[PDB]
């Protein structure tokens, strides 16, 4: 929350291999083309410091939206008006977890896996920064959501008494992003001799949409998270993988 930005803000400025340093040359060449992202190799985090990756491996849902605001304070040291929140795309290679053995222990942990993509969906809209006004008080405000944990985790407040939820979203001043909703099937060479091949459903953020055609072999690095819609049991949730960084092969 505090000062973990500065422990990451020094990582982008000062990481350096033998002669030419990478994350101030990958951040500059992705602004002139107007690409607005960054690609962190995850082996270079733990070579520079181990205490940073200790926080990121334990509780990733609350720290990656802190690194996204640690980039957009550095891109104002290079460009000098509209610079949005940057997106963090990461990739690594530790050990593949097969799709069959995903226990109840891997809830909110960085997990990579593999498989074949069955289907896609149509794009959508999620809100990032919206503007609210009350109906009676007409007291304007601005809620900026940046975290992503699909239904509702951050909603409207109840007072600025007035009525039950007096708040209106104003559609004339906001910003929006995209979502994609894939599906992923395990590779048939890890044969289910008495089973059918299972599947999972992922989500994708603004810069990974429309990247992969149905029918390919991918490797996917994401957060194994959970959501509780009723769209069949008591206190039952459902699993899904929030993708942050799809490392496909050569498409061939």
């Amino acid at each position: 929350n505090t000062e973990i930005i500065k422990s990451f803000k020094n990582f982008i400025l000062e990481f350096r291999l033998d002669s030419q340093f990478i994350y101030r040359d990958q951040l500059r060449n992705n602004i002139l083309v107007k690409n607005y992202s960054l690609t962190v190799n995850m082996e270079h985090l733990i070579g520079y410091n181990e205490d940073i990756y200790k926080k990121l491996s334990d509780e990733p849902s609350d720290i990656i939206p802190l690194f996204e605001t640690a980039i957009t304070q550095v891109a104002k040291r290079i460009s000098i008006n509209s610079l949005p929140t940057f997106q963090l795309i990461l990739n690594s290679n530790a050990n593949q977890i097969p799709l069959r053995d995903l226990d109840s222990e891997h809830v909110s942990k960085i997990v990579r896996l593999s498989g074949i993509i069955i289907s896609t969906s149509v794009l959508s809209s999620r809100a990032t920064y919206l503007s609210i006004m009350c109906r009676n008080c007409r007291h304007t405000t601005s809620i900026t959501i940046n975290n992503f944990n699909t239904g509702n985790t951050v909603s409207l407040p109840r007072s600025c008494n007035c009525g039950p939820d007096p708040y209106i979203i104003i559609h004339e001043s906001s910003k929006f992003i995209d979502q994609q909703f894939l599906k992923l099937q395990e590779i048939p060479e890890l044969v289910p001799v008495g089973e059918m091949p299972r599947n999972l459903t992922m989500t994708c953020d603004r810069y990974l949409t429309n990247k992969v055609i149905p029918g390919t072999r991918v490797t996917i690095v994401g957060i194994y998270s959970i959501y509780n819609s009723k769209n069949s049991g008591v206190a039952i949730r459902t699993p899904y993988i929030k993708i942050l960084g799809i490392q496909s092969d050569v498409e061939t």
Binding site: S125, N152, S155, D165, I169, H171
Partner: peptide, 13 residues
Amino acid sequence: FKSLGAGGMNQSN
């Protein structure tokens, strides 16, 4: 290109 409706934030779910 208007965009109307509520995205499930009004119905507290």
